[PDB]
Symmetry: C5
Subunit: 263 residues, 5 copies
């Protein structure tokens, strides 16, 4: 939407020239000095705000990376400690894949039923969907398979420990994503500063014109671009899970985990 | 609160314009340039102040998230290692929920006793309220449960250590919240700066009135809106265990924890 | 504070400015704002980036002592769950943990801790303690001797023994933390120099202002000087966390809360 | 770099502006310096932050590739401390580990690991690997299959096995991090579009300085541009950590450091 | 070597006060406004640059702080688990101390042999020196001793693992140091910025003179001092493993660790 507000700045500059030669006549003066004070303060505050939003996105991407790492080492460990229990392979792998897809749907407020019925039996799908947090459930189920191998005596308490620790990695991951999606940390102010920048960009012409005249737009559209390009970054980073093509590519990540774990 | 000052600002602007004629006579010249120096100063400073307030608030949110995580897996580990012992599932889950709520009440400066006794017997509720470190007592009893199950031979030293770790995670969380509230040690500056930023925003029109005259208010109010809105940003994040709106949703969190662990146990 | 001296000084110096704006073109001294805005913003940028590190390390000290409390709390919990029985062994442990705390506080305030071990430990260990170069390291080797005596007894398996030793690491690391921050001679490479730089800046500022401001010089000069000197004092505070000033950490109350925690936990 | 190209452009632009100041009041239109101070400072701030992102990316990449050397070093250590005379395993595991390293280099440059693979392994498993979704991951799996092969045969307990499996975790987490920086980079976007805004700001700049600077415009408008153009080129050198350039990370050199190390550890 | 720059700067002020004349010629004027843009820009760039440099320095510090902690508690564990096996202790302590020296000698590219023979048996020194990576070779040899305690039954897999994990705090340290020592990162932007600050300063009076007249050699040396201080701050942090006086002492660090490791073995 930057080119709209840009080429609306062009308008407000034309207005600030065809309405410039009237200022003392009816009052009003305007100087660059306040607007570069304001401008520098806005440039400092944007940098700090973006630094937060960038942080959020970076943290989200790290959480989803740990999904992939943990779910890979758990299947590796099954294949290496119980090399010969493949009917447990499938059960665990499918609970893991279930869990990935199920998290994606959690973050998107979408229906996971569809995806669950492809990987798991309906007797599981209903138990899963019934929970106040189906992801946590799918983890509980993974833990079940892992501990039944223990009571079966196929896993020592040591090796049970090794693998259980990955359900721990996966839980620390679920809690993370809930933290970022459930609790936005003061993102309302992102609206505020947005407003602020726009207001700034549409006044700058009326202040620049005294020094720039017919050059007023050429300068006042450069400056605003540099400011509108910076605020825009906060808009494309602050929703790491959302529908927008820039947000984290969760469908594609999930496909990656499922393809990995299949073996 | 902010809009009180955004109006007071226009008071200072019209007061400046009416106050302008006696400037030359009375011997007062005021120029924007020092005030740009001051404004750019204050702005930098707020950026760093704010930067810190934000980090504190993130630590509190991350620390609470750790509760939800650690308890979820502690329960899970019970139901996976000792799936046929729900007499301990009940007691451990009830200690864990009581840990969360005890904490929430610690940080809110309120009586933790109601939620405490709703989920426990009286015989231990006493020993907890009768401690000066109640939330730490709850962890003592919750560990005592696992130690029991180990003496009983129902947990090996391996599988006991597994749950003991997650207790250690909760202990770190408790130390964390304790430190974060554990005084705002001489951070008086967040006050100082605020007091600064108000003064600035009120003196600003008396500097701007020469170079702007009848334009002065709108500009000043604009700047006072910009400096104030950012400044008040580090009032919110600075108290994170509060009764405020943008503050942490602790009550909702503990509710989520209870429903989580009750639902995991089958209740 | 020490700044409310500096504020009065600034007012004095701007008076000097107004009474000595006359000998200006004569002595050849022209002083304008615009070079001093460069100096001021350069300085503010630098203060932000300096305070940034100062708050970082003060925060680190905070987190280190909090970690002391957590680790010892849990080592006590672990004993009260794996060896519910041997309460007489524990006091010799809790006595070493409290000995460790106070020996840290005296290790940092650089004082003589002998009058404090005698309250916690028999005197045969005390001369052994003072004998070694670093007595906190020694108290740790001793509490380790306790846990490890319980190991050789058979009262602890290598698993449970491990569980406990790890917390003597959660503790050794805090030791080596406070050390690295103490022997860290406070990186005043820029800090004393920044404080100086800001002082000089603040006393000059009126001379660069008076040409443009006249009688209004002292007012604007002290607002600016305050804003800079207040953000600067923020470092005099957050740089001696192991000191005694009202800003520096309360290490005595902190050791004491450690003690009443451990005592309260040992019945 | 080809930066002295845009410096050249600024000299030439200064000559145009120097012999265009006459024409300038064509419509009484001027270009002051004040607004380009606004724009220049703002750009500088934004370069600070953006670069900060770029740098962080680079440093992390460097860290993960260091961890590779670290974890393989320990895993071979434990293979020599615990099974000090297995030898068959001593070579087989090291070949799988070198092959992991080289194959990670290939993975990030999207290049052909068949050649190094064949160099280190029998094609009996070169094919098991090349036919996998993520050959790096199949290689970690094969290493595991050797450590489990040794546990099965009882030559490692579940405890020593666990020790080594922690290190194959250390390696999995490395792979994951690199794969994230490459497959899921945070919005690259703004970087390139700053290089635009910076460039333009350089060329447009002397048209504003000439009015103040006369026949000094070339020598100064260049200095300024250099400053900006230098800081900005940081992003380029620090955003392709895995790519091919002098200024990039010498992954080949690193993989030969790793191989030389592990072959040193096995005589 | 900074005061060289300050004196030279005073000189060029004087030059500015006289050659200001011939600036009427053609048009070679220098304003304050362009240098205030450039100075503010340079202040920002310096800020972010020092930020990175500081971080690299702290990381070096803490790496070493972990040499201290890790070796300390490996010794204590050896005592509380194997208190009777002094003949082992003296060996493993020899290898830990030798690791510290060989690490420092590595980061200084100085020769280690003098310390190695002082601490280790000729036939081990020959091997360590024969390696291409002797610090790692030392960690390995420290391994064979612990792993032979395990091979003798004097250590169980649990306790062995509790020590093995310290050989890892160490391995992680040696890697971190090596990576910190293969820098420069961009290949030396921080040099480029240094020159940029030198030029900015030793052109600044030519731009101040038109306004400050004699007050030029004063305001100017103040400004140059501010920038040159903040920037000289980096050349100190960038080489933390260096011979120069601002860098970590290391030899002091290596001594502190040696005496710490002897005052824990009754030596
Ligand atoms: Zn399979
Ligand atoms: Zn249950
Ligand atoms: Zn019953
Ligand atoms: Zn009550
Ligand atoms: Zn955990
Ligand atoms: Zn702990
Ligand atoms: Zn340690
Ligand atoms: Zn007790
Ligand atoms: Zn071998
Ligand atoms: Zn892991
Ligand atoms: Zn001119
Ligand atoms: Zn000994
Ligand atoms: Zn390791």
């Amino acid at each position: 939407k930057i080119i709209f507000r840009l080429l609306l700045n062009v308008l407000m500059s034309i207005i600030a020239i065809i309405s410039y030669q009237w200022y003392e006549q009816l009052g009003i003066h305007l100087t660059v000095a306040p607007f570069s004070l304001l401008g520098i303060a806005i440039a400092i505050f944007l940098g700090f705000r973006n630094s937060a939003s960038y942080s959020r996105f970076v943290e989200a991407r790290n959480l989803w990376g740990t999904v992939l790492i943990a779910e890979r080492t758990l299947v590796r460990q099954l294949r290496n400690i119980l090399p010969a229990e493949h009917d447990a392979h499938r059960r665990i792998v499918s609970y893991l894949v279930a869990f990935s897809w199920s998290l994606k749907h959690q973050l998107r407020k979408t229906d996971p039923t569809a995806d669950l019925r492809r990987l798991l039996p309906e007797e599981r799908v209903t138990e899963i969907l019934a929970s106040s947090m189906p992801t946590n459930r799918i983890l509980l189920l993974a833990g079940n398979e892992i501990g039944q191998l223990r009571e079966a005596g196929k896993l020592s308490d040591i090796t049970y420990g090794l693998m259980d620790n990955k359900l721990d990695e996966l839980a620390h991951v679920l809690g993370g994503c809930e933290r970022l999606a459930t609790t936005p940390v003061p993102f309302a102010y992102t609206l505020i500063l947005q407003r602020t920048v726009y207001l700034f960009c549409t006044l700058l012409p009326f202040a620049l014109v005294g020094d720039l005249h017919y050059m007023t737009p050429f300068v006042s559209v450069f400056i605003s671009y540099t400011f509108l390009s910076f605020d825009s970054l906060a808009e494309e980073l602050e929703d790491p899970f959302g529908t927008a093509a820039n947000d984290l590519p969760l469908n594609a990540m999930c496909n990656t985990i499922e393809r990995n774990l299949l073996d």
